[PDB]
């Protein structure tokens, strides 16, 4: 519940105001550069469907994962920063990211 980036951003973005979400990834890239991944390398999603795409380059990402001691209302996260390729599932028109499948 106290001031590291993940506790702060999970609350501000309305992920932990009414529950503790176990994991979430934030991508520190411009929205249009993340939207550009939907026309990059097509791959299978973890679920086997094929509307997933992997970024050609690594992107700056922060992984937020609940500690073993986190309990609503006191959600607590471990913050891990990394540069990884992201895999997103895309839908619609415009064909835009709707789910974050993984980082690699």
């Amino acid at each position: 519940s106290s001031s590291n980036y993940c506790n702060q951003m999970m609350k501000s973005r309305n992920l932990t105001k009414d529950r503790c979400k176990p994991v979430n990834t934030f991508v520190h890239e411009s929205l249009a550069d993340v939207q550009a991944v939907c026309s990059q390398k097509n791959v299978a999603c973890k679920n086997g469907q094929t509307n997933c795409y992997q970024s050609y380059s690594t992107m700056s990402i922060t992984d937020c994962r609940e500690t073993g001691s986190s309990k609503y209302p006191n959600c607590a996260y471990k913050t891990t920063q990394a540069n990884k390729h992201i895999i997103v599932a895309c839908e619609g028109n415009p064909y835009v990211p709707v789910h974050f499948d993984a980082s690699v």
Partner: peptide, 15 residues
């Protein structure tokens, strides 16, 4: 209310 694309942005983009 929020589309799936809007929800992705709110939950995962921090430009």
């Amino acid at each position: 209310k929020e589309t799936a694309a809007a929800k992705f942005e709110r939950q995962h983009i921090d430009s």
